[PDB]
Ligand binder design. Structure first.
Ligand SMILES: [Zn+2]
Ligand SMILES: [Zn+2]
Ligand SMILES: [Zn+2]
Ligand SMILES: [Zn+2]
Ligand SMILES: [Zn+2]
Ligand SMILES: [Zn+2]
Ligand SMILES: [Zn+2]
Ligand SMILES: [Zn+2]
Lengths: 145, 145
C-alpha cells in the first residue's frame, strides 16, 4: 500500500472495458465470430472469456471467496453493459482490506488486487489481438490512447 | 495510496518485460522485420517503440522531468537487457513521493505512476499483436500466464 487507490484502479479498469466495448462494436458480425489467425480463436470467444472472467471476479467480491452457445455481438454487448453497471455499483463497496487478502486458488495464493491486475492484463492482451483482427477485416480500430 | 507498493509494481513490470523478451526471441528474423497486418507495422517497430518508451521513463526518473535504422532481433535484445538492468537498478531508488507528483506533459498532468501504467498497458497491447504475428508465422508464442 503506497501507490494506487481502489477508486483509481476501478476507473482505470472501466476505461479499459469501455475501449474493449468499442472494439467489439467495430467488428463486422461475420468476422466477429469467424475470423481468426492460425491456432487462434475468433474475437467472439476472446470477448466471451473476458466477460466470464468479470463474472468470476464479481462472484468473488460477492461471496467472499473465488469459485474456480457463444453470444453474438449484440447479446455480448448487453452482457458487457450489465457487467459494467455491476462493477461500478459493487467494486466501490469492496473493503480495501479485502483487496489484499491472498485467498487460495488451485495455483496458489492471490489477492483480489493481483487477480484484477491479471484480468486487466488479459483484457488488454486479447484486445490487441482484436486490433490485429480488425485491421485484417478492413476496419480502423478505435484509438488505443 | 492504499493498494500497491513500488516494489510490487516494479516486479510486475519486469515480469511483463521478460515475457515480451521471450516473444521477441520467438520471432524468426525475417518475419520480425517484415510481417505485418494491413495498415500495421511489423513487430520490430513495435518493440523499438516499447524500448524507446522505457528510455523515456528512465530519463524522467533520472532528470526529474519528462522530455517529450531499426534494430535487428539481436541488437534489440541487447538493448532490452540493458533497459532491464537499468530499471532494476534505478526504479527502487525512486522516491515514492515522486511517483504521485503529476508532472506536466503536452497532454496534461501525469504522475510517474500513471505513465508507468500506460507504458505497461501499451507493452501488453503490442505484445498481443505480436502473439497474432507469431501465430501467422507458424510459431507457438510463449504462454501468456
Ligand atoms: Zn476457421
Ligand atoms: Zn478471416
Ligand atoms: Zn501482469
Ligand atoms: Zn485468454
Ligand atoms: Zn509490407
Ligand atoms: Zn508475412
Ligand atoms: Zn490503461
Ligand atoms: Zn503503439
Amino acid at each position: 500500500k503506497l501507490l494506487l487507490s481502489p477508486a483509481e484502479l476501478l476507473a482505470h479498469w472501466q476505461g479499459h472495458r469501455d475501449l474493449t466495448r468499442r472494439v467489439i462494436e467495430a467488428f463486422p458480425e461475420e468476422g466477429f465470430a469467424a475470423h481468426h489467425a492460425p491456432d487462434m480463436r475468433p474475437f467472439q470467444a476472446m470477448a466471451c472469456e473476458l466477460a466470464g472472467m468479470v463474472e468470476y471476479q464479481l462472484d468473488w467480491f460477492r461471496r467472499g471467496q473465488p469459485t474456480w452457445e457463444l453470444p453474438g455481438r449484440a447479446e455480448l454487448l448487453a452482457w458487457w453493459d450489465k457487467l459494467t453497471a455491476e462493477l461500478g455499483a459493487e467494486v466501490p463497496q469492496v473493503s480495501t482490506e479485502m483487496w489484499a487478502t491472498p485467498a487460495t486458488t488451485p495455483f496458489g495464493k492471490m489477492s483480489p488486487l493481483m487477480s484484477v491486475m491479471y484480468l486487466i492484463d488479459n483484457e488488454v492482451h486479447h484486445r490487441g489481438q482484436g486490433y490485429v483482427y480488425l485491421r485484417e477485416l478492413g476496419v480502423t480500430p478505435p484509438a488505443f490512447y
